[PDB]
Design an enzyme around this catalytic site. Structure first.
Site, PDB file in Angstrom:
ATOM      1  N   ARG A  41       0.820  -1.207   0.000  1.00 32.36           N
ATOM      2  CA  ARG A  41       0.000   0.000   0.000  1.00 32.36           C
ATOM      3  C   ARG A  41       0.858   1.262   0.000  1.00 32.36           C
ATOM      4  O   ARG A  41       1.592   1.537   0.946  1.00 32.36           O
ATOM      5  CB  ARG A  41      -0.944  -0.011   1.201  1.00 32.36           C
ATOM      6  CG  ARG A  41      -2.020   1.046   1.165  1.00 32.36           C
ATOM      7  CD  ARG A  41      -3.175   0.623   2.049  1.00 32.36           C
ATOM      8  NE  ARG A  41      -4.094   1.724   2.299  1.00 32.36           N
ATOM      9  CZ  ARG A  41      -4.008   2.549   3.335  1.00 32.36           C
ATOM     10  NH1 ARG A  41      -3.044   2.397   4.233  1.00 32.36           N
ATOM     11  NH2 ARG A  41      -4.882   3.537   3.462  1.00 32.36           N
ATOM     12  N   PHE A  95       1.327  10.798   1.706  1.00 27.29           N
ATOM     13  CA  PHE A  95       0.847  10.201   2.927  1.00 27.29           C
ATOM     14  C   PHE A  95       1.877   9.217   3.458  1.00 27.29           C
ATOM     15  O   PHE A  95       2.615   9.544   4.383  1.00 27.29           O
ATOM     16  CB  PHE A  95      -0.520   9.541   2.666  1.00 27.29           C
ATOM     17  CG  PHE A  95      -1.115   8.851   3.862  1.00 27.29           C
ATOM     18  CD1 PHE A  95      -0.945   9.364   5.141  1.00 27.29           C
ATOM     19  CD2 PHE A  95      -1.848   7.679   3.702  1.00 27.29           C
ATOM     20  CE1 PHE A  95      -1.490   8.720   6.240  1.00 27.29           C
ATOM     21  CE2 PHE A  95      -2.400   7.029   4.793  1.00 27.29           C
ATOM     22  CZ  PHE A  95      -2.218   7.550   6.067  1.00 27.29           C
ATOM     23  N   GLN A 105       3.376   1.573   2.912  1.00 29.83           N
ATOM     24  CA  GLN A 105       3.167   0.516   3.906  1.00 29.83           C
ATOM     25  C   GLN A 105       3.748  -0.830   3.498  1.00 29.83           C
ATOM     26  O   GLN A 105       3.775  -1.164   2.317  1.00 29.83           O
ATOM     27  CB  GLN A 105       1.659   0.365   4.132  1.00 29.83           C
ATOM     28  CG  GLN A 105       1.225  -0.538   5.251  1.00 29.83           C
ATOM     29  CD  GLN A 105      -0.296  -0.503   5.422  1.00 29.83           C
ATOM     30  OE1 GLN A 105      -0.956   0.420   4.936  1.00 29.83           O
ATOM     31  NE2 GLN A 105      -0.854  -1.500   6.124  1.00 29.83           N
ATOM     32  N   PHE A 159       4.859   1.455   8.603  1.00 30.42           N
ATOM     33  CA  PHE A 159       4.769   2.426   7.525  1.00 30.42           C
ATOM     34  C   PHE A 159       5.804   3.537   7.693  1.00 30.42           C
ATOM     35  O   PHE A 159       6.287   3.804   8.791  1.00 30.42           O
ATOM     36  CB  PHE A 159       3.334   2.994   7.364  1.00 30.42           C
ATOM     37  CG  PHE A 159       2.824   3.779   8.537  1.00 30.42           C
ATOM     38  CD1 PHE A 159       2.410   3.141   9.697  1.00 30.42           C
ATOM     39  CD2 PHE A 159       2.729   5.167   8.471  1.00 30.42           C
ATOM     40  CE1 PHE A 159       1.906   3.876  10.783  1.00 30.42           C
ATOM     41  CE2 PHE A 159       2.230   5.908   9.547  1.00 30.42           C
ATOM     42  CZ  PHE A 159       1.819   5.253  10.702  1.00 30.42           C
ATOM     43  N   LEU A 215      -2.604  10.964  13.438  1.00 30.88           N
ATOM     44  CA  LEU A 215      -2.246   9.586  13.769  1.00 30.88           C
ATOM     45  C   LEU A 215      -1.540   9.421  15.122  1.00 30.88           C
ATOM     46  O   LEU A 215      -1.364   8.299  15.601  1.00 30.88           O
ATOM     47  CB  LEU A 215      -1.360   9.000  12.667  1.00 30.88           C
ATOM     48  CG  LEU A 215      -2.023   8.615  11.340  1.00 30.88           C
ATOM     49  CD1 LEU A 215      -0.989   7.975  10.411  1.00 30.88           C
ATOM     50  CD2 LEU A 215      -3.156   7.643  11.608  1.00 30.88           C
ATOM     51  N   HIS A 224      -0.446   5.117  17.025  1.00 26.84           N
ATOM     52  CA  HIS A 224       0.551   4.296  16.349  1.00 26.84           C
ATOM     53  C   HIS A 224       1.892   4.533  16.978  1.00 26.84           C
ATOM     54  O   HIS A 224       2.275   5.671  17.193  1.00 26.84           O
ATOM     55  CB  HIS A 224       0.587   4.657  14.870  1.00 26.84           C
ATOM     56  CG  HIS A 224      -0.665   4.286  14.147  1.00 26.84           C
ATOM     57  ND1 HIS A 224      -0.862   3.033  13.608  1.00 26.84           N
ATOM     58  CD2 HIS A 224      -1.832   4.951  13.993  1.00 26.84           C
ATOM     59  CE1 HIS A 224      -2.102   2.942  13.158  1.00 26.84           C
ATOM     60  NE2 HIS A 224      -2.711   4.091  13.381  1.00 26.84           N
TER      61      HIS A 224
END
Lengths: 11, 166
Positions: B57, B62, B65, B114, B123, B127
Site C-alpha cells: 500500500r 501520505f 506501507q 509504515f 495519527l 501508532h
C-alpha cells in the site's frame, strides 16, 4: 479517511 | 526526537530494477520491545522476516506501507512475540521520515509498518513511532510515486530484495 490499518482499511 | 540505538536497512527493487537502500534508525530506549521485534525481522533470525516482502500500500503525500510477509495483502504478518503485542509507547509523535506501527485497533501490533512521506499528526496517540529514515529518503520518495491500482496497490511490485543490520 487516511488510516494505516491491517485488515479493514476504512475511510 | 529520540536517540538512535541501532541501524537497519532495506535494499529495495521494483521489478528487477534496483532503487537503492533505505537506512533506518531505531529508538531502542523509548520502544525496546517494538524495535527488537523490527530488528529481528530485518535479520531473519527466527526463520521469517522482511526479506522478499513488499510494500502493498503506497499513497502519494501520505505514506508507504509494508511488512505483510505472510499474506502480502495487508491482512497478515506476525511479531516475534506470537500473534500481536501491546503498544509500548504512544507519546512519540509522527514526522516525515518516521517509522510507525500499522495495526487493527489498540494493542494489535504485528509486523506491518509504515514510513511517512508527509505530516500525519491525526495519527499520534494511536501508532507507535519507533524510528526514522537516516538515509535513503529519496528512495522512499521514489516509491511513493510508483503506479498503483484501486486499493492503492503497486502495479509493479516494490520488493525488499535484502534487509539487514548495520
Amino acid at each position: 479517511x487516511l488510516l494505516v490499518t491491517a485488515g479493514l482499511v476504512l475511510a | 526526537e529520540p536517540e538512535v540505538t541501532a541501524k537497519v536497512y532495506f535494499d529495495v527493487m521494483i521489478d528487477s530494477e534496483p532503487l537503492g537502500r533505505i537506512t533506518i534508525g531505531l529508538f531502542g530506549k523509548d520502544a525496546p520491545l517494538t524495535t527488537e521485534n523490527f530488528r529481528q525481522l530485518c535479520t531473519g533470525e527466527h526463520g521469517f522476516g522482511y526479506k522478499d516482502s513488499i510494500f502493498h500500500r503506497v499513497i502519494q503525500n501520505f505514506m508507504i506501507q509494508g511488512g505483510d510477509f505472510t499474506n502480502f495483502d495487508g491482512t497478515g504478518g506476525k511479531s516475534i512475540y506470537g500473534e500481536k503485542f501491546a503498544d509500548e509507547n504512544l507519546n512519540v509523535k509522527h514526522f516525515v521520515g518516521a517509522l510507525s506501527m500499522a495495526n487493527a485497533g489498540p494493542n494489535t501490533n504485528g509486523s506491518q509498518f509504515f514510513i511517512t512521506t508527509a505530516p500525519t499528526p491525526w495519527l499520534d496517540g494511536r501508532h507507535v513511532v519507533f524510528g526514522k529514515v537516516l538515509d535513503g529518503m529519496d528512495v522512499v520518495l521514489r516509491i511513493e510515486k510508483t503506479k498503483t491500482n484501486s486499493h492503492d496497490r503497486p502495479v509493479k511490485p516494490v520488493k525488499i530484495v535484502a534487509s539487514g543490520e548495520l
